[PDB]
Design an enzyme around this catalytic site. Structure first.
Site, PDB file in Angstrom:
ATOM      1  N   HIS A  13       0.817  -1.216   0.000  1.00  0.00           N
ATOM      2  CA  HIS A  13       0.000   0.000   0.000  1.00  0.00           C
ATOM      3  C   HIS A  13       0.858   1.278   0.000  1.00  0.00           C
ATOM      4  O   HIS A  13       0.395   2.331  -0.423  1.00  0.00           O
ATOM      5  CB  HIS A  13      -1.087  -0.034   1.089  1.00  0.00           C
ATOM      6  CG  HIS A  13      -0.606   0.288   2.450  1.00  0.00           C
ATOM      7  ND1 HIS A  13      -0.251  -0.690   3.341  1.00  0.00           N
ATOM      8  CD2 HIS A  13      -0.408   1.466   3.086  1.00  0.00           C
ATOM      9  CE1 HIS A  13       0.081  -0.147   4.489  1.00  0.00           C
ATOM     10  NE2 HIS A  13       0.054   1.164   4.347  1.00  0.00           N
ATOM     11  N   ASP A  49       1.152  -7.619   2.406  1.00  0.00           N
ATOM     12  CA  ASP A  49       1.356  -6.194   2.152  1.00  0.00           C
ATOM     13  C   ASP A  49       2.845  -5.813   2.122  1.00  0.00           C
ATOM     14  O   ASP A  49       3.429  -5.303   3.083  1.00  0.00           O
ATOM     15  CB  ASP A  49       0.587  -5.395   3.221  1.00  0.00           C
ATOM     16  CG  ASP A  49       0.278  -4.002   2.757  1.00  0.00           C
ATOM     17  OD1 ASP A  49       0.879  -3.567   1.744  1.00  0.00           O
ATOM     18  OD2 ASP A  49      -0.529  -3.343   3.420  1.00  0.00           O
ATOM     19  N   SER A  64       3.516   2.387   8.336  1.00  0.00           N
ATOM     20  CA  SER A  64       3.419   1.360   7.330  1.00  0.00           C
ATOM     21  C   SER A  64       4.754   1.210   6.624  1.00  0.00           C
ATOM     22  O   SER A  64       5.419   2.230   6.408  1.00  0.00           O
ATOM     23  CB  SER A  64       2.353   1.704   6.309  1.00  0.00           C
ATOM     24  OG  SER A  64       1.160   1.141   6.882  1.00  0.00           O
TER      25      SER A  64
END
Ligand SMILES: [Zn+2]
Ligand SMILES: [Zn+2]
Ligand SMILES: [Zn+2]
Ligand SMILES: [Zn+2]
EC number: 3.4.14.-
Lengths: 697, 697
Positions: B62, B200, B633
């Protein structure tokens, strides 16, 4: 783990019992009238157990719901409020049909029974009548002692027969029920689910005459003095600990043809669930208007909800484990196996073929058969058909009367007509009669019943309306008229202008004929079932698999350990729930409306000496890998020393499909912890007298 | 556990780190340019890390999603298919604005910054401009060395200031992305949720010129040679094991007035969530019919979804923990404690009053200010206003230019106008314009802007349509036209008949006035915020609570252990998910449509040497009690020996309200296991070249 073991398989399970943690000898558990097993009693579709030397019996609230509902009105609702008798004189009758059965003797009668069956040779109907006659004689002899009722059970498809003999206590009284928001916390939303937070317990007391023999209710009766009763545990139950249940599971279908499954999955379960839901919706509506109908239909409603959710759950569980597939594949693998061994395995392969064709036959008429059965099960038509049939049977010698209509059945017949008073409202039954007629007319022309067609006079809303208007004139609505006809002779029935009785007289020829058509089918079955089922069993053993008979309402033992389960990757359900979990679900609205006293005791951490340190609270409910089914409600859960640690009451959602295909990973019993029973009786709805009677206060 | 610790707090966490299981020395962790901390890089709103000596960088899918999308077409859709460069020559540019920032140096400049502020005197606007001029001078000096980018951070409400200097790598290439159905498995349904089954991750490669110095994209550039990189763990990560993360969390609000919380929960989050969901609905619907809209708006849509869902989750979490009530009682406690301290508490009490008033001043215009900002954030008006503002700033000396419009910002501005080519479709932007015009018109009279009212020239559906038809005549739709205006001078803007330009010229005076107002309030805040937030910190220490600054996009360390959490009674989430869990969610429809090679490999139990015997499978994602947020992230998760065991990517649903009120029991990081990155790269979307380069080939 898997298995609903007969007490005669104890040698087979002795080693597994030890390895799981039983600290009693297998010897002691084998004594079915000893300590603790002689404390376990059958209620008739629920189990219970004695928990004091004065006849105190503990079971589930939903097992007692019948009796609570029978003693409830709109203006004193025991379902809502609970019931506590401060003295034994305060205990109210549970109803004329309420029973405690105390096990006396088991005898194998297999050899005799298959003789009598064979002694009729090669006529299907004759075979049924011969087993009927053998059973009736056995029972008549066994019940020759006053105060006992006996039962014949067929196991493993008719490969074994045993005769059970029980002391029949016929005066059962309610001693305590917690409020409905405890006994049935979470209602139909939490039914068949975990996490569960349900206090599902209630107490009866068993009474006999002063001669000490069973009697029907009288104020001169006194408490039964059981030989054996259970004691509460003194060691806290925790995760991994050994548990066992003994009780009376009703039915399973783990030995079945794949087609029996497909019919059930594709037809039986979806149809019944739909009907059950439609009736629920009708009664729900009318009861929101009308508290009399709401209270009177509550037990019926509970049943409809519970079976329909169960079947929804089974359908979902079939899809989750591809039950259709598994059945097909063990069937292929068993038919494979049989021809496999040529000469020796031909009798079994023949059987498969007969069984299979018998099933297509019941299949031809299944909609007729269901619709007609449920139409005749509405209150006034049920009453009239039963009562007329009884007048017909009363003309024969008692030994030839249909089971259900012999002298020994009169108490329960009369009892049911009185109980119906607390479960019947004519405006409501009219709507159910309507519902079922509308479903009858819906039937195709080939699937119809001549005599019902005629009685009705045409296939439309008009005729339905006429039927309903005519039936409305019955006097069978009052207990007194029902009891008049209970005593009347056959001629009096055929003379009557009562329209409900006219319906019965009208259709009975067909019903007796259809009953013959059923007895004939059963007879052909009685040949072919045991041989094929004995082969399923032999195969299972050749695969190292566990071998025990499907449930059949007889006494079984299951054992294992306290443990949760994992429904999805990334999660696990824990073996216990806790008091805090009950209050977290609180909404102030039914079904999540606990008593104020619970809510305050929990907010204050008043754990009453009952906290389990390992979970930091009082346990409420728990999961374990036992193997129970409908009929096991109320069964006592015992620990490694044979002490009471809870009551069985439900299954988790993913378990229910195990009736057909057992899944060890997702099959759990849900039990109410005995410490929650105790906690409720100390802090919420107190019963210091029952606690002191159980030596826990 | 709790805490986004600044590196300078290592002395204070050294002990807790050891107790949690860290086996590296704390001094080895203190070296921010050494092994392993010097491997951790900032991307600008995400974190990443070096994982080879040849400049290989790993982050989340992402995080790379913008770059994957920029290299995607409807016809050749890399989001859908993945990307794999078999040799470093096949790597594609991540886009002109992609960055890797490598930490070079941190300096405390608190004393100098506070003296620049104090020299401004009483006036709030001068106080802001003095801090601005201080920052600009500091940054200009620090960036005198070619290839470095610097950033000034304010911590703890202006009680501490540090300067960071970073090597600024400006040629970032995409080296590998798994297919989107791996990278974002479960899509927006599983976002912010556990159980989670999302691969991810993605890889960049970092490039410099042949002379070793950062450079924009060129074919002559070669891979950067990092001084430090991470290695994959050789020990299997298990439940309870130590993990730590270093990264760049963006912002938290744990030091906040109660009123700031109340406005956010009552107005800011619901309002933004609504506007984002309205836009999502329009774009979703249009993308169904137009696969160019679908691919061009995918990155925008992923932001709207992620934020709106985050905001829904915060609001639910505030109710779960009663955050409103907690903020009210903490503030009553702090203000108590202060009034308690006589005279020496008075400056914090007065600070509190001033902060509260400034919040009220913001609130009075909050609808206008939000609506106007987001209207002007649509593609053409945002371009027109940005570019027009640039032309105004360009007439001032560089040192006096507004931040974001100085010479140092020109590469980002230009890159933005190019990247927009892959993110803009006229027919879609028109509907977004129309949405915001309809929202504008709902504002009441005192929240309207005279310039927009005049430009609109009406208040109804017809005026909206005339304004849209007018704006559709812009030529800013094309990259070349945007770059023309990027270079053009102010008079050229003021002469233009481009309708988006005309809009920008019309409204610019109003935007500048609004900016002055915000700068004025910021200057008042500069005075009161440090004093109050110091008092909050001192109060927390007096209660023995953890004390660490709110996130502010600078480097933080968090640590703890692998562990699940219990969302409700009777249930627990386990710390791992597994491969079989990914396949159990398969539906063959987005977002539950794994690559066929994944479904095959799991079915065949091809675990690739990566099975963890304790869970019976290859681990997919895991939970741990670390304290992360937006900006973390892509952060590497290190084990006790500083080895790579996963990448941070999300939080569980109940965690998100920890931005305002920390809840230890339900706050967890969701990470993707390094074994799952490896497994995907072995069995599903293979990249043997990268595995070899990380020597796990
Ligand atoms: Zn012991
Ligand atoms: Zn009469
Ligand atoms: Zn032009
Ligand atoms: Zn070690």
């Amino acid at each position: 783990g898997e298995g609903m073991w007969v007490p005669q398989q104890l040698p087979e399970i002795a080693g597994p019992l030890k390895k799981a943690g039983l600290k009693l000898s297998p010897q002691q558990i084998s004594d079915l009238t000893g300590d603790p097993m002689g404390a376990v009693v059958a209620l008739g579709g629920c189990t219970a157990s004695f928990v004091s030397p004065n006849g105190l019996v503990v079971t589930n609230h939903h097992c007692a719901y019948g009796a609570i509902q029978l003693n409830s009105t709109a203006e004193n609702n025991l379902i809502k409020n609970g019931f506590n008798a401060p003295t034994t004189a305060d205990e109210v009758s549970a109803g004329p049909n309420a029973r405690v059965f105390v096990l006396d003797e088991i005898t194998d009668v297999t050899k005799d029974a298959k003789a009598a069956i064979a002694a009729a040779g090669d006529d299907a109907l004759a075979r049924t009548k011969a087993l009927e006659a053998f059973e009736k004689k056995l029972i008549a002899d066994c019940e020759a002692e006053a105060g006992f009722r006996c039962r014949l059970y067929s196991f493993s498809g008719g490969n074994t027969y045993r005769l059970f003999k029980n002391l029949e206590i016929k005066d059962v009284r309610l001693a305590y029920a917690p409020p409905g928001s405890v006994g049935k916390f979470g209602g139909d939303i939490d039914n068949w689910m975990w996490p569960r937070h349900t206090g599902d317990f209630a107490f009866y007391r068993a009474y006999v005459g002063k001669d000490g023999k069973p009697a029907a209710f009288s104020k001169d009766n006194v408490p039964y003095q059981p030989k054996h009763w259970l004691k509460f545990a003194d060691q806290p139950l925790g995760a991994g600990d050994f548990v066992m249940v003994a009780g009376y599971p009703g039915s399973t279908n783990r030995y079945a043809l794949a087609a029996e499954f497909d019919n059930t999955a594709q037809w039986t379960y979806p149809t019944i669930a739909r009907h059950y839901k439609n009736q629920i919706a009708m009664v729900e509506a009318a009861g929101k208007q009308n508290a009399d109908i709401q209270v009177k239909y509550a037990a019926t409603m509970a049943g409809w909800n519970n079976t329909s959710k169960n079947y929804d759950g089974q359908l979902e569980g079939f899809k989750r484990i591809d039950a259709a597939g598994q059945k097909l594949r063990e069937e292929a693998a068993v038919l494979g196996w049989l021809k496999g061994q040529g000469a020796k395995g031909q009798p079994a392969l023949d059987a498969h073929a007969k069984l299979l064709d018998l099933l297509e036959q019941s299949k031809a008429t299944r909609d007729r058969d269901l619709t007609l059965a449920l139409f005749n099960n509405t209150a006034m038509l049920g009453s009239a058909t039963q009562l007329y049939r009884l007048s017909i049977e009363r003309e024969k010698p008692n030994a030839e009367r249909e089971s259900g209509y012999q002298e020994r059945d009169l108490p329960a017949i009369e009892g049911g007509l009185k109980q119906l008073e607390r479960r019947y409202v004519a405006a409501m039954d009219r709507q159910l009669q309507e519902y079922w007629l509308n479903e009858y007319i819906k039937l195709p022309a080939d699937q119809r019943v001549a005599a019902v067609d005629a009685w009705l006079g045409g296939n439309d809303a008009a005729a339905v309306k006429r039927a309903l208007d005519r039936l409305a004139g019955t006097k069978l609505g009052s207990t007194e008229e029902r009891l008049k006809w209970f005593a009347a002779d056959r001629k009096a029935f055929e003379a009557s202008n009562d329209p409900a009785i006219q319906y019965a007289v009208a259709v009975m020829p067909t019903l007796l004929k259809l009953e013959q058509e059923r007895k004939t089918r059963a007879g052909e079955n009685l040949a072919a079932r045991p041989v094929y089922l004995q082969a399923l069993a032999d195969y299972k053993k050749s695969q190292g698999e566990f071998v025990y008979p499907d449930a059949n309402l007889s006494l079984r033992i299951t054992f294992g350990n306290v443990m949760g389960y994992a429904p999805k990757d990334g999660m696990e359900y824990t073996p216990f729930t806790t008091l805090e979990g009950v209050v977290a679900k609180e909404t102030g609205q039914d079904p999540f409306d606990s008593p104020k006293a619970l809510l305050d005791a929990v907010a204050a951490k008043r754990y009453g000496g009952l906290e389990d340190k390992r979970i930091g609270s009082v346990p409420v409910n728990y999961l374990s890998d036992l193997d129970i089914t409908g009929g096991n409600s109320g069964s006592p859960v015992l620990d490694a020393h044979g002490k009471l640690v809870g009551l069985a009451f439900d299954g988790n959602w993913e378990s229910v499909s195990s009736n057909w295909v057992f899944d060890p990973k997702m099959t759990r019993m849900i039990a109410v912890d005995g410490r929650y029973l105790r906690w409720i009786m100390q802090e919420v709805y107190p019963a210091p007298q029952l606690l002191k009677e159980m030596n826990v206060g």
